[PDB]
């Protein structure tokens, strides 16, 4: 997993049907780091340092063995400062 800060929400109206009603968030490890998008499975607010699982594991985490996620947020780290 990787520790990332949630930056902002991502909205794609014309996403694939398989994405479901799932929230997507823009997460970067460091402000200024390359941004990535993670399905938010927990309900994470901006500024949160969160735990992000990657390949294959992410799909089940976001809801199915077949969900199209390569990045999901599995948890919010309780105490973290970069």
């Amino acid at each position: 997993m990787k520790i990332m800060q949630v930056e902002k929400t991502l909205v794609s109206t014309n996403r694939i049907a398989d994405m479901g009603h799932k929230p997507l968030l823009v997460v970067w490890e460091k402000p200024g780091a390359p941004r990535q998008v993670a399905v938010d499975a927990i309900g994470c607010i901006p500024g949160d340092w969160v735990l992000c699982v990657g390949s294959s594991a992410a799909r089940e985490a976001a809801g199915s063995k077949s969900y199209p996620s390569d990045l999901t947020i599995i948890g919010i780290i309780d105490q973290w400062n970069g």
């Binding site: 927990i42 309900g43 994470c44 607010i45 949160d48 919010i76 309780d78």
Partner: protein
């Protein structure tokens, strides 16, 4: 902290029991009791996530058989600012 712990019960007696249980279980501050309508009463506690988790589990268990019981027990670990505007800050 920011976590919201919420237990909704069918009636007030169940909820007072839940609230007591939650506050006695962990370091949570009871921020509200709301009579929703229909006989649903929601009691809301705030605290750090661990505290809120412990509290909600304890409360739920406690109020389950008190009266008409538990409708919902839910933990929201970090609450969005917008949702904070609809959340009671101190009991009244």
């Amino acid at each position: 902290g920011i976590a919201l712990g919420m237990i909704e019960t069918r009636g007030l007696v169940p909820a007072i029991e839940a609230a007591d249980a939650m506050t006695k279980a962990a370091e949570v501050r009871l921020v509200g009791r709301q009579f929703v309508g229909g006989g649903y009463v929601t009691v809301l506690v705030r605290g750090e996530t661990g505290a809120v988790n412990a509290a909600v589990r304890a409360g739920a268990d406690a109020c389950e058989r008190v009266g008409d019981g538990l409708v919902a027990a839910h933990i929201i670990a970090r609450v969005h600012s917008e949702v904070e505007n609809i959340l009671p800050k101190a009991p009244q």
